[PDB]
Design a protein around this ligand. Structure first.
Ligand SMILES: CC(=O)N[C@@H]1[C@@H](O)[C@H](O[C@@H]2O[C@H](CO)[C@@H](O)[C@H](O)[C@H]2NC(C)=O)[C@@H](CO)O[C@H]1O
Length: 326
């Protein structure tokens, strides 16, 4: 896996942006997050059927991309990615179904983008030792699956900001609810790409409020993971920094890709990237936690490959060229 990645969600469906067959995806994407594995009535057995092709043909397309150095990852989430793991029985159905699908299509990894049931129950106060069954069981399943395929297996996750950076403000309900998941699988985690969009505004470690879709916002939100931060107003409860190579930023490929806002122009985003990666500032209000940057910062995720293709490949062309230039 490369040191500066473009990770792109791939629609296993037509939402008006059309279907792009796997071999027609721009080679500028390093990782393709197939969207999505879904569940039926038991909210635990994951299912996936390709939107085009026989199973063999789809598997063959995946193999082709893999032969070209690309990674093809199964993403679990979306409106039908309702996953509830209230007990071990549910956990096992989830583990077994996911392994079956990985084995069947030859996916390179899994992407966890599910928020169903993700709440810290009352009393679940320690991110290093979670007690909420959904959280404990999800961690256990992810570890089990990861162990099944080893360190070449790719593990990513794509929570919204309230679940991660939100932990700076509160720890309970959804607030900080992905922190125990991140901590619980940090030794297996390839990268996390929080969704920096449909997000309104966020509070940085400087205690300042920043608006989504601005350079300062992207730096402030990423810095929480690059540096670590105190949780829930508790100076003695510090969530530790991830490795820089585990930190990515998730962005909309086009304005319409995130109808509630969050799109940032490449011109502005490159300012944020230069600051995060090299420690070169751009006159923004936010001060990076490290003087001279986080060189191993892993790159950008986008919703989505399909939206990007409809927007004249603005995202893929701009950021591939930016990263190649480093
Ligand atoms: C990984 C993830 O959570 N992806 C989010 C997308 O689900 C979401 O896009 C929407 O996905 C629905 C399926 O779950 C589609 O029915 C819907 O058409 C689609 N909307 C758009 C604008 O493409 C986007 C919404 O901005 O957020 C992603 O992060």
């Amino acid at each position: 896996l490369g040191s500066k990645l473009l990770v792109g969600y791939w629609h296993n469906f037509d939402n008006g942006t059309g279907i792009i067959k796997l071999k027609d995806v721009s080679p500028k994407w390093d990782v393709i997050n197939v969207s999505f594995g879904e569940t039926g009535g038991d909210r635990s057995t994951v299912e996936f059927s390709p939107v085009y092709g026989t199973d063999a043909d789809f598997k063959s397309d995946i193999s082709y991309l893999k032969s070209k150095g690309k990674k093809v990852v199964l993403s679990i989430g979306g409106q039908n990615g309702v996953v509830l793991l209230p007990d071990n029985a549910a956990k096992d159905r989830f583990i077994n179904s996911i392994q079956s699908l990985i084995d069947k299509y030859g996916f390179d990894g899994i992407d966890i983008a599910l928020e169903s049931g993700i709440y810290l129950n009352g009393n679940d106060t320690n991110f290093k030792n979670p007690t909420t069954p959904q959280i404990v069981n999800l961690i256990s399943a992810i570890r089990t699956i990861s162990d099944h395929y080893g360190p070449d297996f790719l593990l990513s996750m794509a929570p919204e900001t309230a679940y991660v950076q939100g932990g700076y403000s509160a720890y309970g309900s959804i607030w900080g609810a992905y922190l125990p998941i991140i901590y619980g699988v940090k030794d297996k985690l390839t990268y996390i790409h929080v969704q920096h969009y449909n997000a309104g505004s966020g509070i940085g470690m400087d205690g300042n409020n920043y608006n989504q879709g601005t350079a300062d916002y992207e730096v402030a939100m990423a810095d929480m993971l690059l540096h670590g931060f105190p949780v829930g107003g508790n100076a003695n409860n510090i969530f530790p920094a991830l490795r820089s190579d585990q930190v990515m930023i998730g962005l909309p490929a086009a304005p319409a890709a995130a109808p509630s806002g969050g799109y940032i122009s490449p011109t502005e985003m490159k300012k944020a990237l230069n600051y995060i990666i090299k420690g070169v500032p751009f006159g923004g209000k936010y001060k990076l936690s490290n003087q001279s940057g986080y060189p191993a910062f892993r790159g950008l995720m986008s919703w989505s490959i399909n939206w990007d293709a409809k927007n004249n490949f603005e995202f893929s062309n701009n950021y591939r060229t930016y990263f190649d230039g480093l």
